[PDB]
């Protein structure tokens, strides 16, 4: 320990403040009653601000390190698979054959959402981008959902967090299936989640689909590895939200929005149409987008991560998987060789060893199922879809913290008291 | 301006921090440079940090002050309009004859929604509840107007603020229609705002309506009163999903949801359905409804407020608003005789006297409301749709100041780094 | 008696003998048998009436709006002073009350409507109708 005992904040007097320790990484000072004296402190971001106490997920930075319940993000991917890892992180050891099998029982028997809910689908535009329409579709539940909205009742709880895991998929699979025109594929039993996906994603009452065992092990890795990520902005939109006491449905469909969110901007959209609407090693690595990168134009399409100092750690077995997917597809991946390329200037371009723009997870997250024959519109679906699980987590666990509402203070600089006077009539 | 300059937190190092001045209310201790040192406080819930600077509204919740860009809500509430009101609220100043025709006439030409879009309630269940629907249309809202998105382009940030704002009456309209069976009604260019509510809420194609002034003052009146409260937990949620790049109809979709949020929070729920039923001036008059306490829920049902410490400074022009609403509603208000009651137990029972349960604004509304005819499932739409100004105000004031994404601390005290082994074979 | 008939028999025989007066023979039951099954599935159109009425609707009102819909289909059998009419009406509802039944259900729960299959008897093509899901074949329990 450094100064772990106290700490003095003086104005004209002392305020002796206690240090609470965690298991890793930083230690923290106690505020909690300065707000009930007057005295409050500034920090739009919060990035100097501890939001809560949490035993999930544990980042640093510094060191590329990630772990959930204790547990290195490379292990689980490796030797373990979305839906142990989705029972690890919603109860906090890994489980045992027989508690395994019943939760994984419990995901699958709940796949096929309600029949009405998917007449909403066809409502939408078909131009629509399925990840806009996920959140749609994501935002309506409740109405339907309407037995399982209490947050401060453990079966609604319970119940809602199963709708989510299990239906999440058959949502996203949907959204793709109707953006391009062929029909909606129902959730089979007998497959695995990933499995499963896959089938309602690419299946076709024309010809049964065929399930290749490396496209279902990549898939499920890049479910693994997007399963939660700590504190970040898309993961306290579901704090914040559900805080107040909003229903498992809206702080999902708003931690989606947010995980959507920094796609909008019209640089993003601008650099992200030539890294699609362009394929060649001399037409995209070759100063074509490498020279048209202007304002942030990275993080987005697998170049760096403000989490991490040098590295994303889950970008390693998301590059062993990719090797593993283009070797399997070959025939129906050579073409995307790009990725080399891409991976050689992210590596050896100055610009990129200067700015630290190493590929992330979604680098390698992006290739695989871009070589899966998967649009781009469809990625960040999947991702939230993997984040679902961890958006659950972070919420439950707020709740058992006594859900804090949020309500921070302000920095008033406004106009002081005056009074209104207005000649118009209209 | 005393010792407003700074000040000092003793840790290790005597670091000295900035005390920041405002121009009323409390001083904050800029803390944002504390991060990079290491050193990080602790406050679930935010009680103690100011999440950010605004000059949009300032609340003094012992003295029962409420100013919006300054202007006191009693002045506001008597002598403006909704519309003037939202024009204060996004622009900083009361509107010259001009800017106030320019402000209401790009308002009343964006009322209609797109067809396809009013084909979404249609695949709704007609027996959903209408707050449901509501966030559900919201939520969808991006996948249509996928044209001003971009948080970070100016014009997309004004004309997504004027699609809001012209709308939501339209959409929160169609959604009581919808719950009614009634054909929904389409906007009338030569009513007020208020007036148009009123209109798309109750005219059939069968009658003539004729919208009564005094009801047409009185809801602009609950609107008015309804704008915007500060950094509440609704805003401070829309604040946030903003802050991670989250389109506009996603983030008031967020906001309009985290409102209800304790509305179906289970000891709130029931607590509603006990006033609710009810109401034949013998029963919940006469210690029915008072009997039954051991769940709080009283802010919901009109009783205090965790903001204001003596009484609710917005209920003051509502109350005068409601006994108009009443009288003009003379020989047919005769079993509503348990709201002067209700009022007057909370006026003189000493348990309410006690724990502060004045009746706050919502306890008005909900007269006047309810004396108009509206089922209760309406009440929190139509806040959450007056509501929305604040919100724009709110998401907007977080994007000119420098889009400083929500990346809180978490104090970490879950399990250590340990090893990973399945321990089932499946 | 009833009891004889519940024990020793099975729905459709005894429609057989409520009908025709008479216990059927091997080739009797057959015929009837072959024609109640083949005429199990109900019209593409009537299954839209379905939709228009609504989830929270109890299944048996929703049961009688889509029978005293049938007719403006059904035009064709309408005459009840014509033997091939009434027979062919007659059959009609024995045929399909059963997928209409299963369908008032189906959609009271939000599941999705299930066809009927030839290869099932009329009470075990029912509880599949009733059960079944296309995330897995169903298992009629004998
Ligand atoms: N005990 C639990 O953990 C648990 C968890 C989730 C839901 N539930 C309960 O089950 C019902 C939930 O339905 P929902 O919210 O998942 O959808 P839903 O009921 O709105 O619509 C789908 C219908 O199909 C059924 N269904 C879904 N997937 C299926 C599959 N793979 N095979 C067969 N039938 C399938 C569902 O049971 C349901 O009747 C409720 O009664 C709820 O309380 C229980
Ligand atoms: N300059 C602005 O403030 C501003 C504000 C909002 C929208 N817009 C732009 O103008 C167009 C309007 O889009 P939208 O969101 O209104 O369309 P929409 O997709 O919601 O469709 C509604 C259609 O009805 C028209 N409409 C709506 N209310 C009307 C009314 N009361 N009277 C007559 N016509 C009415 C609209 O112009 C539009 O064509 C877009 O291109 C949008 O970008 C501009
Ligand atoms: N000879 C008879 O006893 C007899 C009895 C009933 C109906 N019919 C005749 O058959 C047609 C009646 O159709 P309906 O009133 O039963 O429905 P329908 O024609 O309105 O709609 C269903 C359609 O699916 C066909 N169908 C129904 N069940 C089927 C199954 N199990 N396998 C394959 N196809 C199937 C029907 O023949 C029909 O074309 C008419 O031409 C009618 O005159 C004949």
């Not at 499995?195 to 890795?221: H, K, Q, W």
Request: overall charge negative; hydrophobic content about 40%; glycine content about 6%.
């Amino acid at each position: 320990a450094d100064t772990k005992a106290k700490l003095t904040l003086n104005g004209d007097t002392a305020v002796e403040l206690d240090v609470l320790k965690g298991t890793l990484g930083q230690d923290v000072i106690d505020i909690r009653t300065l707000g009930s004296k007057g005295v409050f402190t500034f920090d739009p971001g919060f990035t100097s601000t501890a939001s809560c106490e949490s035993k999930i997920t544990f980042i640093d930075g510094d060191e590329g390190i990630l772990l959930h319940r204790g547990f290195p993000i490379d292990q689980l991917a490796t030797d373990s698979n979305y839906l142990e890892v989705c029972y690890i992180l919603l109860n906090g050891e890994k489980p045992t054959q027989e508690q395994y099998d019943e939760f994984k029982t419990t995901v699958t028997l709940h796949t096929m959402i309600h029949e009405q809910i998917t007449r909403l689908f066809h409502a939408f535009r078909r131009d629509s981008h399925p990840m806009a329409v996920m959140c749609g579709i994501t935002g309506a539940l409740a109405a339907f959902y309407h037995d399982s909205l209490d947050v401060n009742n453990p079966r609604h709880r319970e119940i809602a967090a199963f709708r989510l895991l299990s239906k999440m998929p058959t949502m996203a699979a949907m959204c793709y299936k109707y953006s391009i025109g062929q029909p909606f594929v129902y959730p089979r039993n007998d497959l695995s989640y990933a499995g499963n996906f896959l089938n309602m994603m690419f299946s076709t009452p024309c010809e049964p689909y065929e399930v290749n065992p490396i496209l279902e092990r990549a898939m499920d890795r890049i479910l693994i590895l997007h399963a939660d990520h700590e504190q970040n902005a898309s993961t306290s939109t579901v704090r914040t939200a559900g805080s107040s006491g909003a229903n498992p449905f809206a702080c999902i469909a708003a931690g989606i929005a947010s995980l959507w969110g920094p796609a909008h901007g019209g640089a993003n959209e601008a650099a992200l149409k030539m890294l699609e609407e362009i394929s060649s090693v001399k037409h995209i690595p070759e100063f074509f987008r490498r020279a048209k990168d202007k304002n942030d134009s990275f993080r987005l399409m697998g170049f760096g991560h403000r989490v991490y100092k040098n590295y994303d750690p889950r970008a390693t077995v998301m590059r062993e998987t990719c090797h593993e997917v283009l070797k399997e597809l070959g025939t129906k991946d050579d073409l995307l060789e790009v990725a080399m390329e891409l991976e050689n200037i992210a590596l050896n371009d100055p610009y990129f060893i200067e700015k630290k723009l190493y590929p992330n997870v979604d680098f390698y997250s992006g290739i695989i199922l871009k070589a899966m024959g998967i649009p781009s519109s469809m990625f960040t679906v999947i991702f939230a879809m993997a984040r679902t699980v961890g958006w659950i987590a972070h919420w439950s666990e707020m709740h058992s913290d006594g859900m804090k509402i949020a309500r921070p203070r302000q920095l008033y600089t406004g106009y002081e008291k005056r009074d209104f006077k207005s000649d118009i009539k209209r």
